[PDB]
Design a protein around this ligand. Structure first.
Ligand SMILES: [Zn+2]
Ligand SMILES: [Zn+2]
Length: 185
C-alpha cells in the first residue's frame, strides 16, 4: 500500500501510533503544563513484520524548564526498556505556550534518536494553540547539518532546510491500538 522514503531514497518502515497517545500524554503531564514547564515522554514499542508498533509511552525522570525538558536519569529509563524489551521509536514533548515547531534544542535532541533509528519521530504538542505535529530531520541533509553544527548557546538558528513533517500514513499511521503509559517519575 503506502510507503515512504528519506530524502536520500532510503525506505522507512511504518510506525503505528495509537490515536489515544497524544491526548493521554497531555493528561499525564498536565500538572507541568499548568505551570508552563515542558515535559517529554518516550515512544517505545516493538518491531513486528517489518513495521514498528508504539506500545508504551514512558515518562522518564527529567528536569523541566519553560523551554527545555532533558532526561536526568537515563539509567532507570534504559533499565526499564531493556527489562520489557522495548525499542526507542521517538519522543513526544509539550510547548505549554509556544506554537508547534522544532526548537534548536529539539533538533539537536532528535538527531540522537534518528541516528539510531532512521524512522525515529518527534511529536510536538502545543496545547495552548490546540495544535500538534510529527517531525523528523531531513535525511541525510538535516542530520548532517545538526552534526556539523558547533554554534554556542542553547537556542541558535540553523540555516537551510533541516526538518520536515513526517509522511502520514506512510511513515506514521495513527490507528486504534492499545496503549500503556509508564510514569517513571
Ligand atoms: Zn520543543
Ligand atoms: Zn545547532
Amino acid at each position: 500500500k503506502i510507503h515512504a522514503y528519506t530524502e536520500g531514497g532510503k525506505p522507512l518502515r511504518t510506525i503505528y501510533l495509537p490515536k489515544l497517545l497524544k491526548k493521554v500524554f497531555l493528561d499525564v503531564v498536565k500538572p507541568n503544563t499548568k505551570k508552563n514547564l515542558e515535559t517529554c515522554g518516550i515512544l517505545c514499542g516493538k518491531l513486528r513484520q517489518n513495521a514498528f508498533f508504539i506500545t508504551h509511552l514512558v515518562i522518564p525522570l527529567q528536569e523541566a524548564t519553560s523551554d527545555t525538558c532533558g532526561i536526568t536519569d537515563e539509567a532507570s529509563l534504559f533499565e526499564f526498556q531493556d527489562k520489557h524489551n522495548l525499542l526507542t521509536l521517538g519522543w513526544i514533548h509539550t510547548h505549554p505556550t509556544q506554537t508547534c515547531f522544532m526548537s534548536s534544542v529539539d533538533l539537536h535532541t532528535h538527531c540522537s534518536y534518528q541516528l539510531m533509528l532512521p524512522e525515529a519521530i518527534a511529536i510536538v504538542m502545543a496545547p495552548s494553540k490546540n495544535t500538534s505535529g510529527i517531525f523528523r530531520l531531513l535525511d541525510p541533509e538535516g542530520l548532517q547539518t545538526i552534526v556539523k553544527c558547533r554554534k554556542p548557546g542553547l537556542f541558535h538558528p540553523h540555516e537551510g532546510k533541516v526538518y520536515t513533517m513526517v509522511a502520514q500514513p506512510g511513515h506514521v499511521r495513527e490507528i486504534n491500538s492499545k496503549l500503556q503509559v509508564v510514569d517513571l517519575r
